[PDB]
Amino acid sequence: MSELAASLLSRVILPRPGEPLDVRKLYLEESTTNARRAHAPTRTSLQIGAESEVSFATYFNAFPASYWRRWTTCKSVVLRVQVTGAGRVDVYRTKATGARIFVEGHDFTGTEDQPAAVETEVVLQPFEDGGWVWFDITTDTAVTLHSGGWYATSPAPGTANIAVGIPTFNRPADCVNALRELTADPLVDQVIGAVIVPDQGERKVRDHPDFPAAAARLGSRLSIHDQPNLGGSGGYSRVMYEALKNTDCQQILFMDDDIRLEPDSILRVLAMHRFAKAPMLVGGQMLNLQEPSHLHIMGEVVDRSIFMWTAAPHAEYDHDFAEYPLNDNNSRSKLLHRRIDVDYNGWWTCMIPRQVAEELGQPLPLFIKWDDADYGLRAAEHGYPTVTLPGAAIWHMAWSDKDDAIDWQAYFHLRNRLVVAAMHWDGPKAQVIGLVRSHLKATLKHLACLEYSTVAIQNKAIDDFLAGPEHIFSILESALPQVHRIRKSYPDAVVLPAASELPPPLHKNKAMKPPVNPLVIGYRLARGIMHNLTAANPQHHRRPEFNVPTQDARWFLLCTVDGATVTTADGCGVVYRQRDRAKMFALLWQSLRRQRQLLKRFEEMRRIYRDALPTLSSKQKWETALLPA
Amino acid sequence: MSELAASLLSRVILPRPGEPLDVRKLYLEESTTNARRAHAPTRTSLQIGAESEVSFATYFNAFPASYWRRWTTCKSVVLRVQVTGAGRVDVYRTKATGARIFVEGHDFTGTEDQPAAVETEVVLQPFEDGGWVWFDITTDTAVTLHSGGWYATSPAPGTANIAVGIPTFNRPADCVNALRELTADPLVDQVIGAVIVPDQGERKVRDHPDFPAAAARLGSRLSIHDQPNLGGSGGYSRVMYEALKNTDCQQILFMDDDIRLEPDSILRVLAMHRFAKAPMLVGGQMLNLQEPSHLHIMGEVVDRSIFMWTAAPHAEYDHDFAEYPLNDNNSRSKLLHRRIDVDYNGWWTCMIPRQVAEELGQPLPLFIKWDDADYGLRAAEHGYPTVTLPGAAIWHMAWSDKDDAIDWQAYFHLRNRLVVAAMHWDGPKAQVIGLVRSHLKATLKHLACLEYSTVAIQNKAIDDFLAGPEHIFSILESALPQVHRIRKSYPDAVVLPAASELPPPLHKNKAMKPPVNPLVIGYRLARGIMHNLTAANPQHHRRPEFNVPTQDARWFLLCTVDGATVTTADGCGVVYRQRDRAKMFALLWQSLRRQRQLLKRFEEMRRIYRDALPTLSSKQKWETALLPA
Amino acid sequence: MSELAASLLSRVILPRPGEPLDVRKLYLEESTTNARRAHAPTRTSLQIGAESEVSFATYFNAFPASYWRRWTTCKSVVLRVQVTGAGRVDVYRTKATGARIFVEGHDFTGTEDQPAAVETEVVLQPFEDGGWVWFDITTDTAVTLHSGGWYATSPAPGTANIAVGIPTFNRPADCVNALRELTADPLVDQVIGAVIVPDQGERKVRDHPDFPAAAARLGSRLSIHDQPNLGGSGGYSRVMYEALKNTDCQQILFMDDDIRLEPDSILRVLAMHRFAKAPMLVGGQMLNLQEPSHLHIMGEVVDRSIFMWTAAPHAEYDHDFAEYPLNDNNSRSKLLHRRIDVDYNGWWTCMIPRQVAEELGQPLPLFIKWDDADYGLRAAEHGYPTVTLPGAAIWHMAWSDKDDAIDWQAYFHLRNRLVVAAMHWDGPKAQVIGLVRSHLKATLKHLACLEYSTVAIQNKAIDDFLAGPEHIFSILESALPQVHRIRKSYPDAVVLPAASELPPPLHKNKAMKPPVNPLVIGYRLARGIMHNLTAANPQHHRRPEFNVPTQDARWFLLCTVDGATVTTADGCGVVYRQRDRAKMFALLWQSLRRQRQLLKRFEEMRRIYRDALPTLSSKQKWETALLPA
Ligand SMILES: [Mn+2]
Ligand SMILES: [Mn+2]
Ligand SMILES: [Mn+2]
Question: How remote is the C-alpha of A41 from its chain's centroid?
Answer: 32
C349-353 and C281-288 strand pairing: antiparallel
Cα separation of C527 and A451, whole Å? 67
Closest to C485 in 3D by CA, of C477, C473, C493: C493
Cα separation of C109 and C140, whole Å? 9
For residue B510, the tally of other CB atoms under 10 A from its CB is: 12
Cα separation of C80 and C118, whole Å? 6
Question: How remote is the C-alpha of A511 from its chain's centroid?
Answer: 34
Cα separation of C180 and C164, whole Å? 13
Q: Is A86 on the interface with B (CB under 8 A)?
A: yes
Among the partner-chain residues B18, B499, B510, the one whose CB lies closest to the CB of A107 is B18
Cα separation of A2 and A19, whole Å? 32
C494: left (phi over 0), alpha (psi -120 to 50) or beta: beta
Q: Which residues are within 8 A (CB) of B93 and not within 5 positions of it... i.e. 6 or more apart? A: B65, B100, B101, B103, B122, B126, B127, B131, B132, B133, B134
**DSSP three-state, residue B432:** helix
The DSSP-derived string for C208-260 is: STTHHHHHHHHGGGEEEEE----HHHHHHHHHHHHHHHH---SEEEEE-SSEE
Q: Is A134 on the interface with B (CB under 8 A)?
A: no
Cα separation of B335 and B155, whole Å? 32
Q: Which residues are within 8 A (CB) of C560 and not within 5 positions of it... i.e. 6 or more apart? A: C527, C528, C531
Q: Which residues are within 8 A (CB) of A88 and not within 5 positions of it... i.e. 6 or more apart? A: A105, A106, A107, A108, A137, A138, A140, B17, B18, B19, B20
Q: For CA atoms B122, B124, B126, B131, give the dihedral sign.
A: positive
Question: How remote is the C-alpha of B431 from its chain's centroid?
Answer: 28
Among the partner-chain residues B36, B37, B551, the one whose CB lies closest to the CB of A96 is B551
Chain A and chain B touch, per 3+ beta carbon pairs within 8 A: yes
Range list of β-strands (E), C229-342: 251-255, 259-261, 281-288, 294-295, 300-303, 308-311, 319-320
For residue B2, the tally of other CB atoms under 10 A from its CB is: 7
Q: Which of B67, B69, B102 to mutate to test the interface with C (most CBs of C within 10 A)?
A: B102
**Kind plus residue range of the DSSP H or E element containing B199:** strand B192-199
CB A70 within 8 A of CB B500: yes
| Cβ–Cβ below 8 Å for A101 and B291 | yes
Residue A330 burial (C-beta neighbours within 10 Å; 0-12, 13-18, 19+): exposed
Look up residue B366 and give its amino acid. Answer: L
Please, which residues bridge with residue C72 across strands?
C276
Cα separation of B622 and B238, whole Å? 9
Through-space distance between the first and last CA atoms of chain C, rounded to whole angstroms: 55
Residue C535 burial (C-beta neighbours within 10 Å; 0-12, 13-18, 19+): exposed
CB C300 within 8 A of CB C312: yes
Look up residue C96 and give its amino acid. Answer: A
Q: Is B146 on the interface with C (CB under 8 A)?
A: no
The DSSP-derived string for A345-379 is: --TTEEEEEHHHHHHH-SPPS-SSSSHHHHHHHHH
Which residues of A are documented as binding site?
171, 200, 229, 256, 258, 396
Question: How remote is the C-alpha of C372 from its chain's centroid?
Answer: 10
Residue C258 in marked binding region: yes
Through-space distance between the first and last CA atoms of chain B, rounded to whole angstroms: 55
- C258-261 contacts at long range (C-beta below 8 A, 24 or more positions apart): C258/C171, C258/C174, C258/C289, C258/C396, C258/C397, C259/C174, C259/C178, C259/C289, C259/C348, C259/C394, C259/C395, C259/C396, C260/C181, C260/C289, C260/C394, C260/C395, C261/C178, C261/C181, C261/C182, C261/C184, C261/C394, C261/C395
Closest to C249 in 3D by CA, of C153, C151, C352: C352
Cα separation of A136 and C180, whole Å? 55
The DSSP-derived string for B63-112 is: B-HHHHHHHBS-SEEEEEEEEEEEEEEEEEEE-TT--EEEEEEEEEEE-S
Cα separation of A94 and A251, whole Å? 32
C297-to-B445, C82, C232 alpha-carbon distances in Å: 56, 33, 21
Range list of β-strands (E), B438-578: 546-548, 563-567, 574-578
C39-42 and C45-48 strand pairing: antiparallel
Q: Which residues are within 8 A (CB) of B453 and not within 5 positions of it... i.e. 6 or more apart? A: B486, B487, B490, B492, B493
Q: What are phi and psi for residue A45, nearest 5 degrees? A: -140, 160
The DSSP-derived string for C43-75 is: TTEEEE-TT-EEE--STTTSB-HHHHHHHBS-S
B72: left (phi over 0), alpha (psi -120 to 50) or beta: beta
Cα separation of A468 and A490, whole Å? 27
Closest to C310 in 3D by CA, of C276, C342, C333, C281: C342
Distance from CA of B427 to the nearest CA of A (A): 41
Chain C CB contacts of B97 below 8 Å: 401, 551
Closest to C224 in 3D by CA, of C210, C239, C213, C237: C239
Distance from CA of B610 to the nearest CA of A (A): 43
Cα separation of A324 and A298, whole Å? 14
A546-548 and A563-567 strand pairing: parallel
Look up residue B27 and give its amino acid. Answer: Y
Please provide the size of chain B in residues.
629
CB C68 within 8 A of CB C77: yes
Q: Which residues are within 8 A (CB) of B602 and not within 5 positions of it... i.e. 6 or more apart? A: B422, B432
CB B259 within 8 A of CB B394: yes
Look up residue C417 and give its amino acid. Answer: R
The DSSP-derived string for B561-573 is: -SEEEEE-TTSS-
**DSSP three-state, residue B512:** coil
**DSSP three-state, residue C320:** strand
**DSSP three-state, residue A311:** strand
Q: For CA atoms B230, B235, B240, B243, give the dihedral sign.
A: positive
Helix B452-466 × helix B479-487 angle, to 10°: 150
| Cβ–Cβ below 8 Å for B571 and A105 | no
Cα separation of C215 and A323, whole Å? 64
Q: What are phi and psi for residue C11, nearest 5 degrees? A: -80, 150
Cα separation of C588 and C583, whole Å? 8
Cα separation of A455 and A136, whole Å? 55
Cα separation of B432 and B425, whole Å? 9
Closest to C362 in 3D by CA, of C620, C596, C68, C165: C620
Domains of chain A, earliest start first: 1-403 (3.90.550.60), 404-629 (no CATH)
CB C132 within 8 A of CB C391: no
DSSP H helical segments within B122-208, as ranges?
172-182, 186-189
| Cβ–Cβ below 8 Å for B291 and A100 | yes
Q: Which residues are within 8 A (CB) of C594 and not within 5 positions of it... i.e. 6 or more apart? A: C459, C462, C463
For residue A323, the tally of other CB atoms under 10 A from its CB is: 14
Q: Is A109 on the interface with B (CB under 8 A)?
A: no
**DSSP three-state, residue A274:** helix
CB B577 within 8 A of CB B566: yes
For residue A333, the tally of other CB atoms under 10 A from its CB is: 17
Closest to A548 in 3D by CA, of A560, A562, A561, A565: A565
Cα separation of A351 and A578, whole Å? 47
Q: For CA atoms C199, C202, C206, C211, give the dihedral sign.
A: negative
Q: What are phi and psi for residue B351, nearest 5 degrees? A: -95, 130
Cα separation of C125 and B163, whole Å? 81
Q: Which residues are within 8 A (CB) of B13 and not within 5 positions of it... i.e. 6 or more apart? A: B27, B43, B44, B60, B61, B262, B264
Among all bound ligands, the one having the nearest atom to the CA of B368 is 2
For residue B223, the tally of other CB atoms under 10 A from its CB is: 15
Cα separation of C566 and C549, whole Å? 6
Cα separation of C625 and C629, whole Å? 10
Question: How remote is the C-alpha of B152 from its chain's centroid?
Answer: 28
CB A272 within 8 A of CB A71: yes
CA atoms within 13 A on the CB side of C331: 2
Q: Which residues are within 8 A (CB) of A173 and not within 5 positions of it... i.e. 6 or more apart? A: A208, A210
**DSSP three-state, residue A387:** strand
Cα separation of C54 and C311, whole Å? 32
| Cβ–Cβ below 8 Å for B130 and C549 | yes
Residue B402 burial (C-beta neighbours within 10 Å; 0-12, 13-18, 19+): middle
Range list of β-strands (E), B211-336: 222-226, 251-255, 259-261, 281-288, 294-295, 300-303, 308-311, 319-320
Cα separation of B333 and B311, whole Å? 16
| Cβ–Cβ below 8 Å for A129 and B567 | yes
CB A332 within 8 A of CB A319: yes
Q: Is A140 on the interface with B (CB under 8 A)?
A: yes
DSSP character for C338?
B
Cα separation of A67 and A277, whole Å? 12
CA atoms within 13 A on the CB side of B482: 15
Q: What are phi and psi for residue B297, nearest 5 degrees? A: -165, 145
| Cβ–Cβ below 8 Å for B36 and A33 | no
Q: Which residues are within 8 A (CB) of A546 and not within 5 positions of it... i.e. 6 or more apart? A: A505, A506, A507, A509, A561, A564, A565
Cα separation of C165 and C319, whole Å? 28
Q: What are phi and psi for residue C602, nearest 5 degrees? A: -65, -40
Cα separation of A347 and A177, whole Å? 18
CB A286 within 8 A of CB A346: yes
Q: Tell me how the structure was determined.
A: X-ray
- Residues A118-144: b if buried by 16+ CB within 10 A, e if exposed: bebebebbbbbbbbbbbbbbbbbeebb
CB B424 within 8 A of CB B374: yes
Q: For CA atoms C10, C15, C21, C23, give the dihedral sign.
A: negative
Cα separation of A539 and B287, whole Å? 77
